[PDB]
Amino acid sequence: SKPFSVPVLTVEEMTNSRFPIPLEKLFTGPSSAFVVQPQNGRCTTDGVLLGTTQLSPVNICTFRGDVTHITGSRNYTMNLASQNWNDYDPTEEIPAPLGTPDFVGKIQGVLTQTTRTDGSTRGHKATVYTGSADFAPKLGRVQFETDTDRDFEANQNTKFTPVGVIQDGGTTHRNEPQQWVLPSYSGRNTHNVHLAPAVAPTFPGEQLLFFRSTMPGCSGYPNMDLDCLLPQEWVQYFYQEAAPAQSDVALLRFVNPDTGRVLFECKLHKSGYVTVAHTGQHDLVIPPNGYFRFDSWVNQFYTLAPM
Amino acid sequence: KPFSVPVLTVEEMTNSRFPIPLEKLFTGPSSAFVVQPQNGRCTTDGVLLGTTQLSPVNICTFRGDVTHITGSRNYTMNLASQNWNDYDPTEEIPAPLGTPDFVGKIQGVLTQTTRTDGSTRGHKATVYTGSADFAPKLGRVQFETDTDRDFEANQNTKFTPVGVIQDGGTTHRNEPQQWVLPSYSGRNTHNVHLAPAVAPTFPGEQLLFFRSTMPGCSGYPNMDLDCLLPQEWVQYFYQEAAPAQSDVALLRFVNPDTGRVLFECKLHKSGYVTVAHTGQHDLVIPPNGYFRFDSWVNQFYTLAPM
Ligand SMILES: CC(=O)N[C@H]1[C@@H](O[C@H]2[C@@H](O)[C@@H](CO)O[C@H](O)[C@@H]2O[C@@H]2O[C@@H](C)[C@@H](O)[C@@H](O)[C@@H]2O)O[C@H](CO)[C@H](O)[C@@H]1O
Ligand SMILES: CC(=O)N[C@H]1[C@@H](O[C@H]2[C@@H](O)[C@@H](CO)O[C@H](O)[C@@H]2O[C@@H]2O[C@@H](C)[C@@H](O)[C@@H](O)[C@@H]2O)O[C@H](CO)[C@H](O)[C@@H]1O
């Protein structure tokens, strides 16, 4: 059976799986006080995609469809299509369209549109509030706030390109976004379905290891921290390789190729997340050429050396 | 290590010249002009070329600090590297990795964070890559924005690209010009360290292009964007680094439903694809179709017409 492996890529060469931006660093912290249940960047080590996860790094937090103007406002409702412009099927056994944002916040970007007949084009500043009663991507509709009440046309292909996040600066700083609070994918007063499960370390002394980026901020004082469980490149790689898991835990070493030495070891769990032996919040200090390498499959009793 | 290409459909892959998905395959003649893109350039044995780097989300992004051009809404960005380290103009590359490789007007958003208090801001911005002051190789690019006061000096600033524009008062689709390289060091300078121009050499053959449609943000732009390799192929070859056993890898495009070959093509070692066809042609492919490496061939192999 095919041997398992992970990509030979540095952290900085890789991409966040929850927003279309580069990874910056590795971070570990306790998470017993809240639920860690992201829906993007979810994949098993043998390559089964979970939650709302799909393969394209650039389609994460993008929307495509057609728009209808909400009379008396500068707001539009997008009737969602699939990422390839085919019809979106709300009965599919997924929480929401693939690539839908998996946190509550205000995401700013640009809504662009092309008129099919003459190739005329237009673009407008736009924000989607993923905590809104009318954020209902699972049902196929999302509301955007824009800076126009007239420029967008009906029945024309329209795209939302995400840029960053905002916060209302009149209130406590860094109180939004809330990266670990899932949206209600079917709108107000609904229950989410088909979720990738919440994750937690079980082993004494262990914490999750997070792949961390800083989202661009577009206004106010947002919390720009964004942690994913797997780099997007690992999702892509496991999907291609489809190597069977020989146990529930793959032991990885983080190696400095400059010296040939292991900096730390960690557990890549079969269901698609990483733990390390550490207590407390810590930005890992790593050499720039460092990368992860698969060592072996281990049993349920394997104890990691302190990170 | 045996050579191979990824099992990904065209629609599952990403353009290597702008951060958007692939849509389709196109072939056409290109003997009348120079095809020399600098992004999406990689050899089959994993050597990166031109301005090519590995992540699709960094293509056509800029990072640095900005200085206000007084009496205007324009800002000069002093470029940093993707990780905010110093940009080194002496590196033997044409321009910073991911620099746009076509002349046009790219619209996006300029964002900024103030280090001390975490205050943030974002403004509509356009970079004209044909401008005299587009000099990314020297570490400077100019943005036109919708503010004359909101950006601060000495604070981390990023440009996120969204799409392209055109001046609608003039002939439609006359810009951008995807096959015209910028002068990376500005006006009256010559580019250095370029990935080479590509052309078919075999009679009856044409380049095969991996095509997307860039978003348009204003006017009547030419939104066609053709790359020589999907970004995922750059990533895959860089990862695999399989030695090339000849200068030409024969690929078959297969329909997995029927097992039947739709067409075959040549993947050249230096990193581009050719097919046997004459004229402009949008390929009609099944959505689940994919490329399969079958064998290395010599310089004399004749493709089946497609
Ligand atoms: C739409 C618009 O005209 N935006 C201006 C505006 O933006 C302000 C405004 O939205 C207030 C409302 O409470 O919130 C902020 O003050 C916001 O400014 C933005 O966030 C602050 C914290 C700073 O980081 C600032 O740089 C950023 O623009 O006013 C600002 C300047 O005050 C700009 O002029 C926007 O274009
Ligand atoms: C800059 C701005 O505020 N944009 C407006 C404006 O945009 C126009 C304008 O820039 C002219 C200048 O010659 O060029 C276009 O007409 C542009 O409109 C954009 O492109 C045209 C072809 C249409 O597709 C249009 O929908 C698109 O906005 O005026 C327009 C109204 O026509 C909008 O109000 C923009 O926000």
Side-chain angles (χ1 to χ4, degrees), chain A residues 1-187 190-307, chain B residues 1-259 261-306:
Chain A
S1 57
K2 183 181 315 184
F4 181 70
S5 64
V6 301
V8 179
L9 293 169
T10 66
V11 172
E12 285 176 18
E13 283 170 338
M14 292 193 286
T15 311
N16 206 291
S17 49
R18 298 180 60 212
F19 202 81
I21 53 179
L23 293 182
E24 293 158 30
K25 61 185 130 158
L26 305 173
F27 173 85
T28 185
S31 60
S32 63
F34 52 94
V35 180
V36 177
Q37 192 166 15
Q39 295 303 302
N40 289 316
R42 302 298 301 268
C43 187
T44 66
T45 56
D46 59 347
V48 177
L49 303 175
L50 307 167
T52 56
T53 299
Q54 49 75 60
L55 294 174
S56 172
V58 298
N59 284 340
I60 301 167
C61 287
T62 61
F63 301 92
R64 291 179 166 86
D66 63 273
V67 291
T68 297
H69 180 240
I70 300 172
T71 303
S73 80
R74 288 183 163 89
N75 303 330
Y76 289 78
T77 303
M78 184 182 281
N79 171 57
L80 300 181
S82 286
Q83 293 293 9
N84 67 351
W85 297 104
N86 286 338
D87 291 343
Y88 165 65
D89 182 355
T91 72
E92 194 177 343
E93 295 282 301
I94 56 180
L98 302 184
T100 297
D102 65 355
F103 60 91
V104 171
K106 300 163 193 157
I107 299 166
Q108 188 180 124
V110 184
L111 219 49
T112 58
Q113 188 181 82
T114 296
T115 301
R116 202 172 288 109
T117 51
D118 61 9
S120 55
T121 64
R122 60 207 60 90
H124 293 275
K125 175 181 179 172
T127 303
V128 56
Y129 173 37
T130 64
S132 170
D134 293 314
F135 184 75
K138 172 59 172 180
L139 304 183
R141 59 180 170 81
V142 167
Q143 186 171 118
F144 294 93
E145 307 186 16
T146 81
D147 65 355
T148 186
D149 63 1
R150 65 192 71 212
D151 196 30
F152 287 112
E153 301 162 16
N155 312 308
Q156 299 295 343
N157 289 6
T158 309
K159 177 186 181 196
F160 178 78
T161 300
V163 172
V165 294
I166 62 170
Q167 179 263 7
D168 167 15
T171 74
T172 297
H173 295 177
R174 297 186 77 250
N175 62 339
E176 56 169 330
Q178 298 169 90
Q179 71 162 321
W180 300 125
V181 180
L182 287 178
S184 303
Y185 291 119
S186 285
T190 67
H191 307 282
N192 289 338
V193 288
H194 313 307
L195 296 175
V199 303
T202 49
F203 219 87
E206 288 189 14
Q207 290 178 168
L208 296 171
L209 183 69
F210 299 99
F211 301 85
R212 174 167 278 198
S213 303
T214 310
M215 294 180 287
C218 304
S219 193
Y221 305 80
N223 186 347
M224 285 169 287
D225 292 333
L226 187 68
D227 295 305
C228 65
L229 301 180
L230 303 169
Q232 183 64 20
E233 287 78 7
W234 288 23
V235 171
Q236 295 174 308
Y237 189 78
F238 299 157
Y239 176 81
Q240 271 308 292
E241 293 289 302
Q246 301 301 308
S247 82
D248 291 318
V249 182
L251 179 63
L252 311 182
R253 55 168 168 276
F254 190 88
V255 177
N256 188 353
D258 296 356
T259 59
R261 281 162 191 274
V262 172
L263 187 64
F264 65 92
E265 58 181 4
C266 63
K267 288 176 180 173
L268 171 58
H269 299 259
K270 176 181 179 178
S271 61
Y273 62 94
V274 182
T275 57
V276 284
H278 191 79
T279 302
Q281 298 189 144
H282 184 67
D283 291 315
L284 279 71
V285 178
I286 60 175
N289 298 322
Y291 71 96
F292 293 86
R293 184 182 161 112
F294 171 66
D295 179 293
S296 58
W297 295 103
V298 297
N299 64 29
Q300 64 267 45
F301 304 115
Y302 189 89
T303 299
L304 295 168
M307 177 202 91
Chain B
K1 181 181 316 183
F3 180 68
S4 64
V5 298
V7 181
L8 292 171
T9 64
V10 173
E11 283 178 12
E12 282 173 335
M13 292 190 283
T14 310
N15 205 289
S16 54
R17 298 181 60 213
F18 200 82
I20 54 181
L22 293 184
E23 292 159 33
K24 60 189 130 159
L25 304 173
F26 175 86
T27 187
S30 60
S31 62
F33 53 95
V34 180
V35 176
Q36 193 167 16
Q38 294 302 300
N39 288 316
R41 303 298 300 267
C42 184
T43 67
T44 59
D45 58 345
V47 175
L48 302 176
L49 306 166
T51 54
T52 298
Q53 50 77 62
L54 295 175
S55 180
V57 301
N58 288 332
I59 305 167
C60 287
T61 61
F62 302 93
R63 289 176 167 83
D65 63 274
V66 293
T67 289
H68 185 217
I69 300 173
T70 298
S72 81
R73 298 161 121 103
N74 305 329
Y75 287 80
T76 301
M77 184 181 282
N78 307 296
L79 300 180
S81 288
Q82 170 209 295
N83 64 13
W84 299 105
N85 286 336
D86 294 343
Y87 165 65
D88 182 356
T90 67
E91 197 180 344
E92 294 186 300
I93 55 178
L97 302 184
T99 297
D101 65 356
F102 60 92
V103 169
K105 300 164 192 159
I106 298 168
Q107 185 182 125
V109 185
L110 218 49
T111 56
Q112 187 180 82
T113 296
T114 303
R115 201 171 288 108
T116 51
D117 61 10
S119 56
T120 65
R121 58 207 60 90
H123 292 274
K124 176 182 178 173
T126 301
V127 55
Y128 174 36
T129 62
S131 174
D133 294 317
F134 184 75
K137 174 60 173 178
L138 302 181
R140 300 186 305 272
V141 307
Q142 188 172 296
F143 295 94
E144 307 185 15
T145 81
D146 65 353
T147 184
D148 65 3
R149 66 191 71 213
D150 197 30
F151 289 114
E152 301 163 17
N154 310 125
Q155 300 295 341
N156 290 6
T157 310
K158 179 187 182 197
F159 177 80
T160 303
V162 169
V164 294
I165 65 169
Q166 179 263 8
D167 168 15
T170 73
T171 296
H172 295 175
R173 296 186 77 250
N174 60 337
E175 56 168 329
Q177 298 170 90
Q178 71 161 319
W179 299 125
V180 180
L181 288 178
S183 48
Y184 292 119
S185 286
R187 187 171 177 277
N188 249 320
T189 67
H190 307 285
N191 289 339
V192 294
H193 296 298
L194 297 181
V198 300
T201 43
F202 215 86
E205 287 189 15
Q206 290 179 169
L207 296 170
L208 181 69
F209 300 98
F210 300 85
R211 174 166 279 194
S212 303
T213 306
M214 296 181 285
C217 304
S218 196
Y220 305 79
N222 186 347
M223 286 169 286
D224 292 334
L225 186 68
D226 295 304
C227 66
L228 302 179
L229 302 169
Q231 184 65 22
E232 286 79 7
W233 286 22
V234 172
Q235 296 174 308
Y236 189 80
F237 299 159
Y238 177 81
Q239 200 58 211
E240 292 288 302
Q245 302 302 307
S246 82
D247 292 317
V248 182
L250 177 60
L251 311 184
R252 272 54 184 275
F253 190 87
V254 178
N255 184 349
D257 294 355
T258 60
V261 177
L262 188 64
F263 66 91
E264 61 181 8
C265 65
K266 287 174 180 171
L267 170 56
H268 299 258
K269 175 183 177 180
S270 60
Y272 61 97
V273 180
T274 58
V275 289
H277 190 83
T278 301
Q280 296 191 329
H281 181 63
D282 290 314
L283 281 72
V284 178
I285 59 174
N288 48 7
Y290 72 100
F291 293 86
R292 182 184 74 206
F293 169 68
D294 284 350
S295 60
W296 295 101
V297 297
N298 63 28
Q299 302 290 47
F300 306 117
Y301 190 89
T302 298
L303 293 169
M306 57 82 66

